[PDB]
């Protein structure tokens, strides 16, 4: 029932959409066909969901029937199997629930973690300071800091900012991540041209393949040293202990094939999502020093200029919390979220969506819904503050989406964000370089929006 552009025969309408700037075209279609609209990519049926109401209805109200994930043809090059699907793209079932339940459970046992982020935050602060006067791109440093946190939890160790193996991981990660979006990936899935045609099959997802084999290196290295008599200190070990405990049946999702994919899912996700947000954070603090100052004093009032920040401070810091949430909302890191699929027929905003329809939850249309925020497209921290200035998180705040598939990294993310953000502003003040012009608000698109290239200088307080 949703209204869609007519699909030209053969390729469908995958021409009509620009996959190197997707969020734009989905907005340009939302203005003719309205809030809910549907497009055909070749055989595949799709129904883009825009605005809070339409999203919440599918993911929460009809959540039990939209938790599944649509199949990806091009995954074959990675070598995915029903046996090993990881978490991120695994189909709604026991294999997914096992790894999902294992993931969040294992992170919790691994206060202790709280201290570890601040430790890493130091090494970051230092790296920052070591360029006191000169302008520099903080994107790369943040990437390293955040990556060491998720590395600890999963690989048991942290890496030096100079380590070649480490920097190669980071690079492949960001490049692999771009691969997720584009023209070639979408059209490959649709038609069997990918198969038995090495020329394209090789080029697409290439970096991710290079990324995984650099992970397998780290894993086999890590596996070789795993001593069973020692309780797990990292997820890899914890997983290995499960592979031992569950050697009984080959049906279990705990296997060598899954280990690399699961660890990849968590390791990669922690690496870029938080780090990009922190890049947006610093940016919005140099283009809005007025907001930067207010936070900076609040820090001094509660935390102080001398002791490292602790999660227990967030409670007593309404502005810093509202800014961060605003940074995420405005940042709009993951515009179209992650593709969903209907397990059965459902109804959204009147229209009726048939089973097997790929769903695209446009979180941007929610994070910036006109009927919710007072100043949607402007950086307005007061979107999370009431009359007496107490923090309040609105429903429409869904940077982590919602439903059974909602981000299982939110707790970690929340922890990482607040601790890194405050630790930075506490010991530093960030301004645009004197000579340099105003850096753009707008963000480049590579599946996830990132702050357009910019520089800043960091000076102690
Ligand atoms: C600012 C930080 C982050 C943002 C904005 C974010 C956002 C998202 C979004 C939009 C989804 C899709 C939800 C859906 O399918 O409806 C998702 C899923 C997921 N995220 Fe994140 N995430 C962040 C951090 C993390 C971290 C730190 C981890 C792991 C350490 C992580 C791991 C995952 C996993 C495994 C899934 C898939 C879960 C499933 O499919 O059941 N994320 N996240
Ligand atoms: C919120 S959607 C999101 C957010 C951050 C990342 C990614 C997706 N992925 C996908 C995970 C991928 C990892 C390999 C095994 C199969 N799985 C699905 C990614 C892909 C490639 C490089 C970096 C990353 S980090
Ligand atoms: Na993929």
UniProtKB/Swiss-Prot annotation:
<dbReference type="GO" id="GO:0005737">
    <property type="term" value="C:cytoplasm"/>
</dbReference>
<dbReference type="GO" id="GO:0016712">
    <property type="term" value="F:oxidoreductase activity, acting on paired donors, with incorporation or reduction of molecular oxygen, reduced flavin or flavoprotein as one donor, and incorporation of one atom of oxygen"/>
</dbReference>
<dbReference type="GO" id="GO:0004497">
    <property type="term" value="F:monooxygenase activity"/>
</dbReference>
<comment type="pathway">
    <text>Lipid metabolism; fatty acid metabolism.</text>
</comment>
<dbReference type="GO" id="GO:0005783">
    <property type="term" value="C:endoplasmic reticulum"/>
</dbReference>
<comment type="pathway">
    <text>Cofactor metabolism; retinol metabolism.</text>
</comment>
<keyword id="KW-0492">Microsome</keyword>
<dbReference type="GO" id="GO:0009822">
    <property type="term" value="P:alkaloid catabolic process"/>
</dbReference>
<dbReference type="InterPro" id="IPR017972">
    <property type="entry name" value="Cyt_P450_CS"/>
</dbReference>
<dbReference type="InterPro" id="IPR002401">
    <property type="entry name" value="Cyt_P450_E_grp-I"/>
</dbReference>
<dbReference type="GO" id="GO:0016491">
    <property type="term" value="F:oxidoreductase activity"/>
</dbReference>
<dbReference type="InterPro" id="IPR050182">
    <property type="entry name" value="Cytochrome_P450_fam2"/>
</dbReference>
<dbReference type="GO" id="GO:0008203">
    <property type="term" value="P:cholesterol metabolic process"/>
</dbReference>
<dbReference type="GO" id="GO:0020037">
    <property type="term" value="F:heme binding"/>
</dbReference>
<dbReference type="GO" id="GO:0062189">
    <property type="term" value="F:anandamide 14,15 epoxidase activity"/>
</dbReference>
<keyword id="KW-0503">Monooxygenase</keyword>
<keyword id="KW-1207">Sterol metabolism</keyword>
<keyword id="KW-0256">Endoplasmic reticulum</keyword>
<dbReference type="GO" id="GO:0008210">
    <property type="term" value="P:estrogen metabolic process"/>
</dbReference>
<keyword id="KW-0753">Steroid metabolism</keyword>
<dbReference type="GO" id="GO:0042178">
    <property type="term" value="P:xenobiotic catabolic process"/>
</dbReference>
<dbReference type="InterPro" id="IPR008069">
    <property type="entry name" value="Cyt_P450_E_grp-I_CYP2D-like"/>
</dbReference>
<dbReference type="GO" id="GO:0016098">
    <property type="term" value="P:monoterpenoid metabolic process"/>
</dbReference>
<keyword id="KW-0472">Membrane</keyword>
<dbReference type="GO" id="GO:0043231">
    <property type="term" value="C:intracellular membrane-bounded organelle"/>
</dbReference>
<feature type="binding site" description="axial binding residue">
    <location>
        <position position="407"/>
    </location>
    <ligand>
        <name>heme</name>
    </ligand>
</feature>
<dbReference type="InterPro" id="IPR001128">
    <property type="entry name" value="Cyt_P450"/>
</dbReference>
<dbReference type="InterPro" id="IPR036396">
    <property type="entry name" value="Cyt_P450_sf"/>
</dbReference>
<keyword id="KW-0443">Lipid metabolism</keyword>
<keyword id="KW-0153">Cholesterol metabolism</keyword>
<dbReference type="GO" id="GO:0008202">
    <property type="term" value="P:steroid metabolic process"/>
</dbReference>
<keyword id="KW-0408">Iron</keyword>
<dbReference type="GO" id="GO:0009804">
    <property type="term" value="P:coumarin metabolic process"/>
</dbReference>
<keyword id="KW-0560">Oxidoreductase</keyword>
<dbReference type="GO" id="GO:0005789">
    <property type="term" value="C:endoplasmic reticulum membrane"/>
</dbReference>
<dbReference type="GO" id="GO:0005506">
    <property type="term" value="F:iron ion binding"/>
</dbReference>
<comment type="similarity">
    <text>Belongs to the cytochrome P450 family.</text>
</comment>
<dbReference type="GO" id="GO:0019369">
    <property type="term" value="P:arachidonate metabolic process"/>
</dbReference>
<feature type="binding site">
    <location>
        <position position="265"/>
    </location>
    <ligand>
        <name>substrate</name>
    </ligand>
</feature>
<keyword id="KW-0276">Fatty acid metabolism</keyword>
<comment type="function">
    <text>A cytochrome P450 monooxygenase involved in the metabolism of fatty acids, steroids and retinoids. Mechanistically, uses molecular oxygen inserting one oxygen atom into a substrate, and reducing the second into a water molecule, with two electrons provided by NADPH via cytochrome P450 reductase (NADPH--hemoprotein reductase). Catalyzes the epoxidation of double bonds of polyunsaturated fatty acids (PUFA).</text>
</comment>
<dbReference type="GO" id="GO:0042759">
    <property type="term" value="P:long-chain fatty acid biosynthetic process"/>
</dbReference>
């Amino acid at each position: 029932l949703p209204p869609g552009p007519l699909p030209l025969p053969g390729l469908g309408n995958l021409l009509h959409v620009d996959f190197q700037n997707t969020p734009y075209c989905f907005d340009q279609l939302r203005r003719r066909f309205g809030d809910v609209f549907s497009l055909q990519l070749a055989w595949t049926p799709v129904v883009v969901l825009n605005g809070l109401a339409a999203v919440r209805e599918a993911l929460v109200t009809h959540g039990e029937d939209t938790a599944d994930r649509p199949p990806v043809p091009i995954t074959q090059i990675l070598g995915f199997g029903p046996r090993s699907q990881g978490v991120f793209l695994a189909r709604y079932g026991p294999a997914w629930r096992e790894q999902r339940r294992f993931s969040v459970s294992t992170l919790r046992n691994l206060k202790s973690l709280e201290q570890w982020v601040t430790e890493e935050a130091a090494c970051l602060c230092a790296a920052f300071a070591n360029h006191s006067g000169r302008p520099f791109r903080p994107n790369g440093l943040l990437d390293k800091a955040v990556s060491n946190v998720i590395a600890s939890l999963t690989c048991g160790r942290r890496f030096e900012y100079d380590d070649p193996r480490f920097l190669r991981l980071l690079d492949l990660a960001q490049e692999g991540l771009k691969e997720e979006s584009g023209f070639l990936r979408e059209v490959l899935n649709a038609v069997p041209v990918l198969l038995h045609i090495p020329a394209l099959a090789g080029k697409v997802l290439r970096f991710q393949k290079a990324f995984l084999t650099q992970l397998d290196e780290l894993l086999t290295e890590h596996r070789m040293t795993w001593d069973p008599a020692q309780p797990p200190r990292d997820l890899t070990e914890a997983f290995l202990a499960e592979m031992e405990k569950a050697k009984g049946n080959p049906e279990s999702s705990f296997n060598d094939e899954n280990l690399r994919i699961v660890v990849a899912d968590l390791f990669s996700a922690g690496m870029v999502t938080t780090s990009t947000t922190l890049a947006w954070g610093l940016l919005l603090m140099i283009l809005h020093p007025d907001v930067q100052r207010r936070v900076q004093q609040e820090i001094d009032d509660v935390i102080g200029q001398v002791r490292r920040p602790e999660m227990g401070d967030q409670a007593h810091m309404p502005y810093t919390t509202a800014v961060i949430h605003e940074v995420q909302r405005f940042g709009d890191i993951v515009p179209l979220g992650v593709t969903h699929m209907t397990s059965r027929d459902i109804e959204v905003q009147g229209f009726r969506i048939p089973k097997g329809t790929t769903l695209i939850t446009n979180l941007s249309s929610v994070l910036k819904d006109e009927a919710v925020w007072e100043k949607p497209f402007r950086f307005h921290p007061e979107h999370f503050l009431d009359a007496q200035g107490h923090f309040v998180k609105p429903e429409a705040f869904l940077p982590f989406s919602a439903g059974r598939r909602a981000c299982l990294g939110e707790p970690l993310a929340r922890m990482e964000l607040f601790l890194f953000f405050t630790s930075l502003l506490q010991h530093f003040s960030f301004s645009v370089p004197t000579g340099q012009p105003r850096p753009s608000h707008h963000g480049v698109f590579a599946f996830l929006v990132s702050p357009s290239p910019y520089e800043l200088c960091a000076v102690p307080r």
